[PDB]
Design a protein around this nucleic acid. Structure first.
Ligand SMILES: [K+]
Ligand SMILES: [K+]
Ligand SMILES: [K+]
Ligand SMILES: [K+]
Ligand SMILES: [K+]
Ligand SMILES: [K+]
Ligand SMILES: [K+]
Ligand SMILES: [Mg+2]
Ligand SMILES: [Mg+2]
Ligand SMILES: [Mg+2]
Ligand SMILES: [Mg+2]
Ligand SMILES: [Mg+2]
Ligand SMILES: [Mg+2]
Ligand SMILES: [Mg+2]
Ligand SMILES: [Mg+2]
Ligand SMILES: [Mg+2]
Ligand SMILES: [Mg+2]
Ligand SMILES: [Mg+2]
Ligand SMILES: [Mg+2]
Ligand SMILES: [Mg+2]
Ligand SMILES: [Mg+2]
Lengths: 35, 300, 59, 257, 101, 237, 92, 196
RNA sequence: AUAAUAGUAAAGAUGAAAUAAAUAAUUAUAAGACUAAUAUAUGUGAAAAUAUUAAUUAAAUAUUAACUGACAUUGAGGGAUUAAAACUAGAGUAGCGAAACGGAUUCGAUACCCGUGUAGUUCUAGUAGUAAACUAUGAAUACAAUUAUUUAUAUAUAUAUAUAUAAAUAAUAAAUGAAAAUGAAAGUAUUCCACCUGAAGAGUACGUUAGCAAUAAUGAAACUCAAAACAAUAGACGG
């Protein structure tokens, strides 16, 4: 999963995607797809 | 070339084996390939091995580990007795049946994913089937795999947001399901333990198909009667059945109602006498043993 | 049974060895020689087993 | 590998068959095809085992007492029996291929006709042939073999076998068909045979039998159907016994010189 | 007498194959000679890959490698590797100094 | 042991005896040995290829031949310590012969342990006569056994009918099961048919085993009794 | 893994005092049982009748019964015969 | 076994397999042909060929090889000194004179001719590792020798080595048979030239 | 060792002996020294040394990556460390134990054995720099035929073995050697240092330097002799 993981104890992938505009550019992408 | 010929030679055909020739544990199946020499070759100590077998050996069957050793001898035992166990099983004409009603392993059946619904049970069996693995080679299954699985992150970071985006925004109960399937789907192409060393079916003990009746001059045989021996004079402790020695196999004997009085009389010498038994069924366990169930037919 | 415990814990041997003082150099020499004899006996028994096995097979 | 033996005057046999018994097609079935069929199956059964280095006659004796080697015994017995039949019905045992010999008049010897009278209460050879034809029709319902055998007492007698029954070893003669009903006299013979086999002390449970065949007739469908047809096997046995090669049959009787 | 000592009779397990020799005295003697504690490895923590020095506060596990009087067993008896024997002995000596063993 | 000189120079030492006159008559072997000189080099010879798998011996992969990054993600820019050690010994050590078929053979007998109980004859007849067509498993001249499966698997992978060795192996295994089942039935039926026509057998396999077990169990009875009487007396002490 | 210990070259391979098993005399054990039978059930008790009869037969001709009263070990003969073959010594 | 390797045989080894060294049969064939030609030459020249083999079971092969080459054999024990101390060991035994057809001339031999050493012209040794004495005597006596050289055997001790398994009676009898027939052909070619 | 407790009449020692409310048992207290098994000094350390536990500080391994670019080897003089004994000063002193005084043994016994036991053995701060300080074998580099056994790293998989490459040890080929033997050196070569030139006199004398001292280092000659020494062989002899 990496950034898109459900684990309470996540890895640095999540923190990297945050600072790299990936967890945000994917949340908007998913929401835009839902639209 | 000489190398090509050697690979196909009869000595090459025997698979490498270093298992103890003197084993005192539990024996469930043959461990060494029986070697046989003809009478003419035996007269000349010729067995097709590297060196002549000592003339003291009068048997025509042996089992060996090494063609030669640092002690300048062949490591062999002049015995071939597992063949008589197989041939005695054939004479009892009891087909081996699955107690779980599984498909016949010797037929190419069209199977489906009925049992594949346990993808998370067996995909993790590769890392969890490590009962007897080294403390660090098993630990190499953690970093080596992590990198391989971590190389599919981009593929699963796009497929999951294109095939099941709702789960990524609602719950991971289904996401975990898509993960187990993803790896297996991307692993079926891979070759992890592509060769399975588990025993296939009977292991070669019997190739008889159930169903056939035994015609005899006295009519069709309905119950198979086989001479045997009772080993213990007291039922197996914690078990409601005694043990018998029938045709090179140890079976569990169930008595009609009572135990014959020769038991108490004979005592610990009960094995000195031969009784007649009926072989109810024969099953195969995963350890490679045969579970033979018998019945002490007593003159009545 | 009690005697077996004494001999498996070397109680009688230790008591006798503590009656008189031995110089460290002599102690080391005796420990080296005893180990050699123990290992030598193990090598001897291994060779006798090979002989018996070889005899049984007709060599 | 067991190979089909080469027969004398094989070119004639593949063109004109065996005169007065079988045609060219009939002989190709009984020998060139069936003997190939048997030898190949024997090779597949015995290759890789000690039996591969033994001739079929020795194989049947070695395996006669082993219940689970009956398949090998059957193949060895049939192969030996078939070449015993093809040998005494053959125009000439000597190879007159380059001598173009067309005069082979072989007649029963005096030792054979003397043992026939002694063993059959003065019956003539012609009468014994009728008994042989009768025995085949009433004792061999299906496949089998008809033999004229000699025992250790110098007496010639008639033995019939069902399927592949050896004449040499009485425990495997297969002369009684137990699929049908048997009389108390036949059961007595079987019971007495079982007792003899139980008196042997050998760990292989084998007995001594010195019976030897003198004449062999193949009663299998591979030998007569194509030329005679279902139901005409008695006409086939009559022709075989009337056109036997007596140079071979006479040599099978021990003289002692 | 209808009784025999257990040392004079062999009990053939269930599901195993046997030869006629398995009923002889030679089998009895042969089984005694080749009777080694080879099943210990699967039950021997110190032969599994764990570091014996992590058990210095668990006297119960350490007490499996000392005699009745507390004498550390020689490597010939424990069957451990040189490193594990070295580490195990250190663990036991440390355990003794802490007041647990 | 030192390389001997006097065994291969018998002709030259003999010629000195004849030229001087110490030996009057030429030996019968003298002319024969002169025409067929002995080999007298006794040298160690290098080898540059494993004959079994064709692996090249004595080849060093230079850093120029490894331009791409490794499994660790690093480029190789200099020779490593192993590359800088002379490897002359590998040229002279007899190569270890290996075969893919050996791996399948070990698998087959691990999957079918009882195939080991079928006796195998290691004595060869004539390797040069084997004319086998491995399009089919059965062959005239050899038994049906594990080797039949392995050779069939190799033919399938050699003809490229199957790509993966596992798939070819499984295909061969089923052909082996079919042939094994036809033979198990031919033997059972042959025994049944013979008994139905009056065939009699002295001792069966089951009976043979019972008799052998009795012989052993009788000696065991005596010893047990003897050793259960020495114990009783010795324990009385 | 079990440590193999290899000996240096030796002038001989010999057992100083080979252990030979010596079976017990059947008459002595018969006497040892009869003596015990008398210790429990009493001397001349009818319970020891069979013991007395057996002892008399065992000792009738020789008080220790006829026995194979000889046994020697051959380990040293074989050890000396096979040592050079099995010692694993390097070639000369 | 590779553990028993005598590294002086390195050039004869094809490889190792199943814990043993595999001898290169291409070299065995070339060495065998050369050795066979030597036996044929000596036989055709009328020389004395002795076949020495002291391993159990070799007698039958050794006796027939001697018979078909009109040679000699020793299967029981090589007496140390048979060649170097021949007068103390073999002087008492009887000699005979023969013609070019190998038929006894029947001429009585002077005591001078019956005490002279009768040295073999060629020595064939089946098991050289157990016959060092004979090989060294052959060297001292300038007698060419042929022997089967296994991977643990010293090649330089013999004039014409034949690399090959010396432990199997089949391998030994196969190599001995080839050498014996080569001798037979030499003998037949010598008897034929006398006729014509 | 001291005290208590009950309990007693011998205890202790030796080849046998004799010299100096106990001994034994159960408690309590004090003191000094030592470190059972594991254990192979395996390993570690330059050597000397180093094995009850923990902690702090310092040093030490393999592979890979990058970097420096011959910066190396050896090493006169010099420097540092260096067992046991010994000495200086101050503490300590259970046990052991030169000496001394006694008891025995013996023809005698300045001994071996026993008792009482001082210096010493322990710690702190120093002096001194000697041992069969030994592998009686200086250090470095290149190289040469095998096996076995461990260890380490790596590789593979049909997962627990298998395959590799080093190190250690054992037995060897070759080679070397007076041989015993050495065996990766006591082999094949190269480089640097130390040292030797018949025995005895002598590691002495004298001088010098250093030390609180004992001593340590350096280190001769005359006279006399045709000896003297090593390995191995066959004997003889051995409480
Ligand atoms: K050390
Ligand atoms: K530069
Ligand atoms: K410098
Ligand atoms: K200096
Ligand atoms: K003190
Ligand atoms: K030393
Ligand atoms: K130096
Ligand atoms: Mg050999
Ligand atoms: Mg006290
Ligand atoms: Mg300690
Ligand atoms: Mg060390
Ligand atoms: Mg320096
Ligand atoms: Mg002081
Ligand atoms: Mg004193
Ligand atoms: Mg100082
Ligand atoms: Mg001094
Ligand atoms: Mg000095
Ligand atoms: Mg020292
Ligand atoms: Mg340095
Ligand atoms: Mg001085
Ligand atoms: Mg000396």
């Amino acid at each position: 999963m990496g950034s898109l993981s459900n684990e309470k104890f996540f890895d640095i992938s999540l923190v990297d995607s945050y600072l790299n505009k990936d967890l945000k550019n994917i949340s908007n992408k998913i929401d835009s797809k839902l639209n | 070339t000489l190398a090509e010929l050697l690979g196909r030679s009869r000595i090459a055909q025997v698979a490498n084996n270093h298992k103890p020739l003197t084993y005192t544990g539990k024996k469930f199946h043959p461990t060494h390939q029986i070697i046989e020499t003809k009478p003419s070759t035996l007269y000349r100590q010729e067995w097709g091995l590297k060196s002549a077998i000592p003339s003291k050996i009068k048997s025509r069957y042996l089992v060996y580990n090494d063609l030669d050793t640092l002690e300048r001898i062949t490591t062999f035992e002049p015995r071939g007795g597992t063949q008589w166990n197989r041939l005695r099983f054939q004479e009892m004409g009891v087909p081996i049946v699955s107690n779980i009603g599984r498909q016949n392993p010797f037929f190419k059946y069209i199977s489906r994913p009925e049992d594949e619904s346990h993808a998370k049970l067996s995909l993790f069996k590769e890392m969890k089937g490590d009962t007897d693995i080294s403390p660090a080679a098993m630990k190499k299954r953690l970093k080596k795999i992590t990198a391989l699985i971590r190389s599919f992150q981009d593929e699963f970071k796009e497929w999951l947001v294109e095939n099941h985006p709702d789960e990524l925004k609602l719950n991971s109960n289904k996401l975990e399901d898509y993960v187990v399937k993803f790896l297996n789907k991307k692993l079926e192409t891979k070759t992890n333990k592509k060769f399975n060393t588990e025993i296939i079916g009977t292991g070669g003990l019997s190739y008889s198909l159930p169903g056939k009746l035994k015609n005899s001059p006295n009519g069709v045989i309905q119950r198979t009667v086989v001479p045997g021996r009772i080993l213990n004079v007291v039922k197996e402790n914690n078990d409601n059945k005694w043990l018998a020695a029938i045709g090179g196999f140890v079976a569990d004997v169930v008595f009609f109602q009572s135990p014959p009085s020769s038991f108490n009389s004979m005592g610990d010498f009960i094995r000195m006498k031969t009784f007649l038994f009926e072989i109810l069924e024969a099953s195969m366990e995963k350890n490679g043993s045969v579970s033979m169930h018998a019945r002490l037919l007593e003159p009545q | 049974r009690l005697n077996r415990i004494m001999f498996e814990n070397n109680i009688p041997g230790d008591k006798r060895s503590q009656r008189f003082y031995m110089k460290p150099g002599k102690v080391a020499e005796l420990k080296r020689s005893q180990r050699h004899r123990k290992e030598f006996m193990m090598g001897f028994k291994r060779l006798i087993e090979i002989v018996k096995d070889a005899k049984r097979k007709g060599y | 590998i067991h190979v089909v033996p080469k027969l004398p005057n094989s070119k004639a046999l593949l063109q004109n068959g065996v005169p007065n018994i079988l045609s060219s097609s009939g002989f190709k079935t009984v020998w060139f095809d069936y003997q190939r069929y048997l030898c190949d199956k024997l090779t597949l059964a015995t290759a890789g085992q000690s039996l591969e280095s033994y001739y079929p006659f020795h194989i049947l004796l070695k395996t006669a007492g082993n219940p689970l080697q009956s398949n090998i015994f059957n193949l060895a017995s049939s192969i030996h029996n078939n070449h015993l039949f093809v040998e005494n019905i053959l125009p000439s045992a000597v190879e007159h291929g380059t001598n173009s010999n067309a005069v082979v008049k072989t007649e029963p010897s005096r030792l054979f006709l003397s043992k026939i009278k002694d063993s059959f209460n003065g019956s003539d050879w012609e009468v014994v042939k009728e008994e042989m034809i009768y025995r085949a029709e009433n004792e061999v319902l299906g496949q089998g073999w008809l033999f004229l055998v000699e025992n250790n007492e110098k007496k010639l007698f008639i033995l019939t076998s069902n399927n592949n029954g050896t004449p040499y070893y009485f425990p495997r003669n297969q002369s009684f068909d137990l699929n049908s009903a048997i009389s108390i006299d036949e059961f007595a013979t079987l019971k007495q045979m079982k007792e003899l086999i139980g008196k042997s002390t050998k760990l292989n449970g084998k007995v001594q039998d010195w019976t030897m065949p003198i004449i062999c007739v193949n009663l299998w469908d591979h030998a007569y159907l194509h030329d005679y047809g279902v139901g005409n096997r008695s006409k086939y046995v009559k022709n075989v016994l009337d056109n036997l090669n007596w140079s071979v049959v006479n040599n099978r009787i021990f003289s002692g010189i | 007498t209808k009784k025999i000592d257990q040392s004079l009779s062999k009990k053939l397990p269930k599901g195993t194959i046997y030869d006629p020799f398995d009923f002889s005295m030679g089998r009895i003697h042969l089984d005694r000679k080749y009777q080694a504690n080879k099943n210990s490895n699967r039950n021997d923590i110190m032969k599994s890959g764990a570091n014996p020095l992590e058990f210095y506060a668990r006297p119960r596990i350490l007490s499996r490698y000392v005699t009745s009087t507390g004498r550390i067993q020689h490597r010939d008896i424990t069957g451990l590797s040189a490193k594990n024997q070295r580490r195990l002995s250190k663990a036991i000596r440390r355990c003794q100094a802490i007041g647990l063993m | 042991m030192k390389i001997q000189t006097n065994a291969v120079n018998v002709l030259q030492r003999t010629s000195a005896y004849l030229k001087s006159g110490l030996l009057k008559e030429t030996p019968a072997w003298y002319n024969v040995v002169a025409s067929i000189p002995p080999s007298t080099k006794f040298t160690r010879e290098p080898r540059f290829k494993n004959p079994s798998n064709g692996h090249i011996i004595g080849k060093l992969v230079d850093v120029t031949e490894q331009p791409h990054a490794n499994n660790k993600g690093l480029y190789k820019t200099r020779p490593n310590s192993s590359d800088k050690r002379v490897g002359v010994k590998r040229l002279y050590r007899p190569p270890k012969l290996t075969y893919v078929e050996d791996r399948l053979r070990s698998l087959f007998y691990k999957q079918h342990p009882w195939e080991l109980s079928r006796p195998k004859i290691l004595v060869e007849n004539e390797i040069g006569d084997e004319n086998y067509d491995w399009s089919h498993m059965l062959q005239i001249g050899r038994p049906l056994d594990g080797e039949s499966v392995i050779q069939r698997t190799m033919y399938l992978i050699k003809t490229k009918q199957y790509g993966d060795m596992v798939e070819a192996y499984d295909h061969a295994r089923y052909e082996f099961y079919a042939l094994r089942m036809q033979e198990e039935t031919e033997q059972q039926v042959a025994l049944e048919e013979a008994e139905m026509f009056g065939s009699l057998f002295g001792v069966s396999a089951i009976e043979h085993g019972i008799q052998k077990e009795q012989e052993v169990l009788d000696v065991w009875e005596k010893k047990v009794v003897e050793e259960t009487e020495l114990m009783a007396a010795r324990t009385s002490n | 893994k079990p440590p193999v210990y290899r000996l240096p070259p030796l002038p001989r391979l010999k057992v100083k005092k080979p252990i030979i098993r010596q079976e017990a005399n059947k008459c002595l054990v018969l006497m040892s049982n009869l003596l015990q039978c008398w210790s429990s059930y009493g001397h001349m008790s009818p319970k020891c009748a069979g013991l007395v009869t057996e002892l008399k037969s065992c000792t009738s001709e020789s008080a220790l019964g006829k026995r194979n009263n000889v046994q020697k070990s051959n380990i040293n003969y074989h050890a000396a015969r096979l040592y050079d073959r099995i010692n694993g010594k390097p070639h000369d | 076994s590779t553990s028993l390797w005598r590294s002086s045989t390195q050039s004869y080894i094809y490889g190792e397999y199943k814990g043993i060294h595999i001898i290169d049969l291409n070299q065995t064939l070339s060495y065998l042909k050369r050795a066979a030609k030597v036996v044929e030459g000596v036989s055709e020249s009328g020389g004395i060929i002795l076949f020495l083999g002291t391993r159990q079971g070799q007698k039958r092969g050794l006796e027939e090889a001697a018979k078909k080459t009109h040679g000699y054999y020793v299967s029981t024990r090589w007496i140390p000194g048979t060649l170097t101390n021949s007068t103390e060991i073999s002087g008492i035994w009887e000699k005979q004179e023969i013609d070019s057809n190998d038929n006894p001339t029947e001429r009585a031999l002077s005591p001078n001719e019956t005490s002279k050493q009768v040295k073999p012209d060629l020595l064939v040794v089946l098991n050289p590792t157990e016959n060092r004495n004979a090989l060294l005597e052959a060297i001292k006596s300038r007698v060419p020798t042929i022997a089967i050289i296994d991977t643990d055997s010293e090649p330089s001790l013999v004039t014409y080595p034949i690399p090959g398994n010396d432990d199997s009676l089949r391998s030994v009898n196969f190599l001995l048979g080839v050498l014996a027939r080569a001798g037979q052909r030499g003998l037949q070619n010598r008897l034929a030239r006398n006729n014509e």
